[PDB]
Amino acid sequence: RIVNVKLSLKRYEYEESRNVEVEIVLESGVKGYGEASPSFRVNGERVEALLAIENAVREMITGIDVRNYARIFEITDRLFGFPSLKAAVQFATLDALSQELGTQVCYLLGGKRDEIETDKTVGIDTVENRVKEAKKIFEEGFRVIKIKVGENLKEDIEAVEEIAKVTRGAKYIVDANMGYTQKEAVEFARAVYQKGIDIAVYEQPVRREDIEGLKFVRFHSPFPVAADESARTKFDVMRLVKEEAVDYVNIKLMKSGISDALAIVEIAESSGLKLMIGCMGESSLGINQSVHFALGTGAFEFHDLDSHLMLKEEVFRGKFIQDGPRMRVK
């Protein structure tokens, strides 16, 4: 049984990310840990707001045995306004449970895979700095490169071409972050396509509420279209599946929590949907949540878990092994 719950502000400098770490302590002395990396843009969350409800969170789950984690999951699903916190508390519960069970979270989730590979992101910058970053990334061993676009169609097309030139042999994931209209999103795909470049996953090119737009882009795009911001809850995904809107759903524990993340996996594998997993601004201890999730369920074609690689940490705090673009368990 949980005896106490603690939330703590943890700041990480890039190369700042304000997260909230969750610590759950059991009667047995075991301690579980999770990390909430909130998003105002995606979830409408504010870190100060997450910190203000520490007592309510404590009260919601204190006294519940982690062996009845499904009860903790149902209760924390009520924190739909604080999804990143939902994620952290649910994972910390499993982290604690897997310790009392003498195993790891990934195995608790099925231990499907022993290794996964993450991409690294080439953010928005001048075409020059972009390509320069792509080369650096490619050099470090990354063979899946995430390219951010969305605010300048013509320049975005040019950037992808230039990046492809200096990274032949790698696959590309393009995230337009809701910056394009339907017609622009289609034009982006076609232009890239005519240059002989292939995009493994074309992420959320239109507005989050524009489900028909996603469907429209999916139909004309020669590349697989993914929903990210349009896919926060299991209910959003069921709607996406019913409207036959996308080829992929990009799961983020920060949007869905563990509970919804698990449902989305089942729904996807039951409807021909492909999956990729992403992140927000998690540090090593937070990315750990996604690593175990991706390793145990083994449900993802691609993994975009590089946020911890953009932060400075005195010491590694994840319960996994980071080896180049690869992650494994021990």
Residues at the interface with Mg ion (CB under 5 A): 175, 203, 228
Determine which residue in the list 96, 176, 258, 262 makes contact with a second copy, applying CB under 8 A: 262
316 makes contact with a second copy (CB under 8 A): no
> By three-state DSSP, how is residue 279 classified?
coil
Q: Which of residues 3-62 bind a second copy (CB under 8 A)?
A: 40-41, 43-46, 48-53, 55-56
Starting at the edge strand that comes first in sequence, how are the strands of the sheet with 144-148 ordered?
A: 120-122, 144-148, 171-175, 199-203, 225-227, 248-251, 274-277, 302-303
Active site annotation includes 86: no
List 86, 252, 274, 319, catalytic entry: 252
Given the complex with a second copy, which of 50 and 277 has the nearer CB atom?
Answer: 50
Given the complex with a second copy, which of 132 and 328 has the nearer CB atom?
Answer: 328
C-beta separation of 146 from 160 below 8 A: no
Active site annotation includes 252: yes
Given the complex with a second copy, which of 51 and 310 has the nearer CB atom?
Answer: 51
Q: Which of residues 71-100 bind a second copy (CB under 8 A)?
A: 71, 73-74, 78-82
281 makes contact with a second copy (CB under 8 A): no
| Least distance between a second copy and beta carbon 129 (Å) | 26
**236 annotated as ligand-binding:** no
Burial (Cβ within 10 Å: 0-12, 13-18, ≥19) of residue 58: middle
Determine which residue in the list 1, 59, 235, 313 makes contact with a second copy, applying CB under 8 A: 235
**119 annotated as ligand-binding:** no
How many CA atoms does the CB half-sphere of 72 hold within 13 Å? 30
C-beta separation of 260 from 283 below 8 A: no
| Least distance between a second copy and beta carbon 298 (Å) | 6
Q: How far apart are CA 120 and CA 138, in angstroms?
A: 9
**177 annotated as ligand-binding:** yes
| Least distance between a second copy and beta carbon 263 (Å) | 4
By a kind-dependent CB cut-off of 5 to 8 A, residue 119 interacts, out of Mg ion, a second copy, none, with none
Tokens for 320, please give them: 């996994």
C-beta separation of 276 from 251 below 8 A: yes
Beta pairing class for 17-26 and 31-36: antiparallel
**304 annotated as ligand-binding:** yes
Q: How far apart are CA 188 and CA 150, in angstroms?
A: 10
Tokens for 90, please give them: 């649910």
Helix segments in 175-252, DSSP class H: 182-194, 211-220, 234-242
List 86, 120, 148, 234, catalytic entry: 148
Contact letters (x/-) for a second copy, 140-179, by CB under 8 A?
----------------------------------------
Active site residues: 148, 252
Residue ranges of the binding site:
121, 146, 175, 177, 203, 228, 279, 304, 306
